[PDB]
Structure formats: C-alpha cells, structure tokens
A = this chain, B = another copy of it.
C-alpha cells in the first residue's frame, strides 16, 4: 500500500540517524495541490489554518511551490512562493525546499501511498514534520498509519497541530 523506502542520510538535510525516505519516487505524480492535515509548530507557519502546498514542474528540473493559508487572527488568506530541488537522484524523495524567503532546508518524503494520495514529510530535523493529503480530510485509518511511521522514525507525534480544513 505504501511506497518503498530505505534509510537515508545527508549531512544538514536529514534528521540525526537518518530517516527512511522514498526510493522509487515519481515526481510527476507528486505535482499539484496538497492539503496540510497536520504539522509540528513550525515558526514559518505559525497561526495558519486551511493550509495547502501546490507543486509544479520547472524548466530547470526543480519545482515551484505555492503555499496558501488562512490567518484567522487577521481574517485573511495569505500566499507565498518557493522552490524545491532534488539533492540527488530524482527517484529519491529528498529535496531542498525554500521554507521562508531565501532560506532552504531539507524536505524528505518518509511515507507515501502508491497512488500519491497521502504523504508524511519531514524536514532537516525532528522539529519539522507534515502530513499531506490530496483531500482536506483523511480517514482514521490513514491517520493511524502515518502516525505509526512517524513514531517508528523517532518523531514525537504528540507535537502535531491538526490543521483546520474544510470538512
């Protein structure tokens, strides 16, 4: 049901001890819009609800990233744009991504279903984790499975904020 992963380490881009990263990735199936179902309390997203990320293919072989979110303390929709590059082979879902302004960090897909409907992504350390989905909600069954992989890879899943989404 899930894509194959293997242990993967790159200095400064992956968490200590490495993490299991997707190793037969097909970037074209990753394109388009994902809803952020859950995130750790990342400073660059603080406050945001109804968050999505939209990926598109660039001529230089990277991805454009469009981040959208609603700030309920301002009552406003916000958008920001970034870029993503593979750090090695494009079959390995390890990227560097601009998370705020010109600052890039590691972006590692550590679980992904074979139909590219749901993903667990971690940043360069264990303070950065996301659950992404093609739909604004996920099943309890998908939630359990994603939480289980995160726990196995050493993350503390009680740090998740469950992001408000439609439905």
Contact = CB atoms under 8 A, between A and B. Distances in A.
A67 to B, nearest CB: 18
Interface stretch (A5-13, A29-37, A49-57, A135-143): A135-143
A75 B118 CA distance: 12
Copies of this protein in the complex: 2
A141 B48 CA distance: 13
A53 B147 CA distance: 34
A72 B75 CA distance: 33
Contact of A73 (B72, B115, B140): B140
A152 interface: no
Interface string A53-77: 0000000000000000000111110
A149 to B, nearest CB: 16
A152 B9 CA distance: 49
Contact of A117 (B75, B140, B142): B75
Contacts of A139: 72-74
Contacts of A142: 73-74
Interface string A73-104: 11110000000000000000000000000000
11 contacts: A47-B141, A72-B139, A73-B139, A73-B140, A73-B141, A73-B142, A74-B139, A74-B141, A74-B142, A75-B117, A76-B115
Given A74-B139, A75-B117, 9 more contacts: A47-B141, A72-B139, A73-B139, A73-B140, A73-B141, A73-B142, A74-B141, A74-B142, A76-B115
